């Protein structure tokens, strides 16, 4: 067949398998790319925490956490703890427009993990709560 | 300013005096050999004492890294020891108007009440000839407003070949205060 960019809906039967596992079963890599930090947490299909890493947990301080090298370092630290539990294929769910939004995705690949999808779950309200006032800096 | 958090897998110094999680002294070992123990037992290294010339690092579990600082959050709360003194500066002019001298004299009263150090400097007024007789009479005029609260730390000096005078003020020390108090009572009550 051809190749579609839309994810295979669970209900309808498909033929796309990864290591004999359906798309639903693949573990999920929740990335929260903030402006001053980047936390990464890998979970299974049944929401079971397997690995957690962040720039702070890798020995970075203050303004070094909001860089692209600290997010990549955090991906290698989470892709090395989850590869010992039998994780190879993951579903990336990026949340945030921070510096370590794409650099953490590269770090997960530098740990032996293969990314099959890229999901964006950045919080966008349909007017809800009021942000802080604009600054003059 | 430091925190009891893991340093990570990046060590600056090649030789470290590693310490066991249970407090056993592993002994000095190569930097590469330190990371092997962080994976073999999945433990994080924290620098216990920077001051010592030989690098000292202790590897403990994440729960052990939380309990440590969780006690440093109480020791400082129970017995806080913050003694740094901020230093403030003022640069006046001999011909400074009284109104501006009363506003700047009230600013010094807030600094002396917060146990700050006030560096006061006086300069020759614009196109004004004056000696150090009335140029040094402003310190005595400022200190008089604070009789007991403030006292000289340093004394007027010719910082810049005599054109300018610099002095430092401080909040009166507890002991000194008591002495001032004691003296005040005798003058009026005994009479």
From Swiss-Prot, chain A:
Residue span relative to the full protein: 58 to 194 of 194
Keywords in alphabetical order: Mitochondrion, Ribonucleoprotein, Ribosomal protein, Transit peptide
Cell location: Mitochondrion
One Gene Ontology term from the biological process aspect of the record: translation
Keyword Transit peptide recorded: yes
GO cellular component labels: mitochondrial inner membrane; mitochondrial small ribosomal subunit; mitochondrion
Family recorded in the similarity comment: Belongs to the universal ribosomal protein uS11 family.
Complex formation: Component of the mitochondrial small ribosomal subunit (mt-SSU). Mature mammalian 55S mitochondrial ribosomes consist of a small (28S) and a large (39S) subunit. The 28S small subunit contains a 12S ribosomal RNA (12S mt-rRNA) and 30 different proteins. The 39S large subunit contains a 16S rRNA (16S mt-rRNA), a copy of mitochondrial valine transfer RNA (mt-tRNA(Val)), which plays an integral structural role, and 52 different proteins.
Protein name: Small ribosomal subunit protein uS11m
Domain of life assignment: Eukaryota
Gene Ontology MF terms: RNA binding; structural constituent of ribosome
Swiss-Prot record, chain B:
Classification lineage: Eukaryota, Metazoa, Chordata, Craniata, Vertebrata
UniProt keyword Glycosyltransferase, yes or no: no
Residue range from the parent sequence: 72 to 262 of 278
Name of the protein in question: Translation initiation factor IF-3, mitochondrial
Gene behind this protein: MTIF3
Primary role: IF-3 binds to the 28S ribosomal subunit and shifts the equilibrium between 55S ribosomes and their 39S and 28S subunits in favor of the free subunits, thus enhancing the availability of 28S subunits on which protein synthesis initiation begins.
Single GO cellular component term: mitochondrion
Superkingdom to which the source organism belongs: Eukaryota
Primary residence: mitochondrion
UniProt subcellular location: Mitochondrion
GO biological process: mitochondrial translational initiation; ribosome disassembly
MF annotations from Gene Ontology: ribosomal small subunit binding; ribosome binding; translation factor activity, RNA binding; translation initiation factor activity
Keywords, in A-Z order: Initiation factor, Mitochondrion, Protein biosynthesis, Transit peptide
Protein family: Belongs to the IF-3 family.
């Amino acid at each position: 067949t051809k190749f579609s960019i839309y994810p295979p809906i669970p209900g309808e039967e498909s033929s796309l398998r990864w290591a004999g596992k359906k798309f639903e079963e693949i573990p999920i890599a929740h990335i929260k790319a903030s402006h001053n930090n980047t936390q990464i947490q890998v979970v299974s299909a049944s929401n079971e925490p397997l690995a957690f890493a962040s720039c702070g947990t890798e020995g970075f301080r203050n303004a070094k956490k909001g860089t692209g090298i600290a997010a990549q370092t955090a991906g290698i630290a989470a892709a090395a703890r989850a590869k010992q539990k039998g994780v190879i294929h993951i579903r990336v769910v990026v949340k945030g427009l921070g510096p370590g939004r794409l650099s953490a995705m590269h770090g997960l690949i530098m740990g032996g993990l293969e990314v099959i999808s890229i999901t964006d779950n950045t919080p966008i309200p349909h007017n809800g709560c009021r942000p802080r006032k604009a600054r003059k800096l | 300013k430091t925190a009891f958090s893991n340093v990570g897998r990046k060590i600056s110094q090649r030789v470290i005096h590693l310490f066991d999680e249970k407090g056993n002294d592993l002994g000095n070992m190569h930097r590469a050999n330190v990371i092997r123990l962080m994976d073999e037992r999945d433990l994080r290294l924290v620098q216990r004492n920077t001051s010592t010339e030989p690098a000292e690092y202790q590897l403990m579990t994440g729960l052990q890294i939380l309990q440590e600082r969780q006690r440093l959050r109480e020791m400082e709360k129970a017995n806080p020891k913050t003694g740094p003194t901020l230093r403030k500066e003022l640069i006046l002019s001999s011909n400074i108007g009284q109104h501006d001298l009363d506003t700047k004299t009230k600013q010094i009263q807030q600094w002396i009440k917060k146990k700050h150090l006030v560096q006061i400097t006086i300069k020759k007024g614009k196109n004004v000839d004056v000696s150090e007789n009335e140029m040094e009479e402003i310190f005595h005029q400022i200190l008089q407003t604070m009789p007991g609260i403030a006292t000289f730390s340093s004394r007027p000096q010719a910082v810049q070949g005599g054109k300018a005078l610099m002095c430092v003020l401080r909040a009166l020390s507890k002991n000194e205060e008591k002495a001032y108090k004691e003296t005040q009572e005798t003058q009026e009550r005994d009479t």
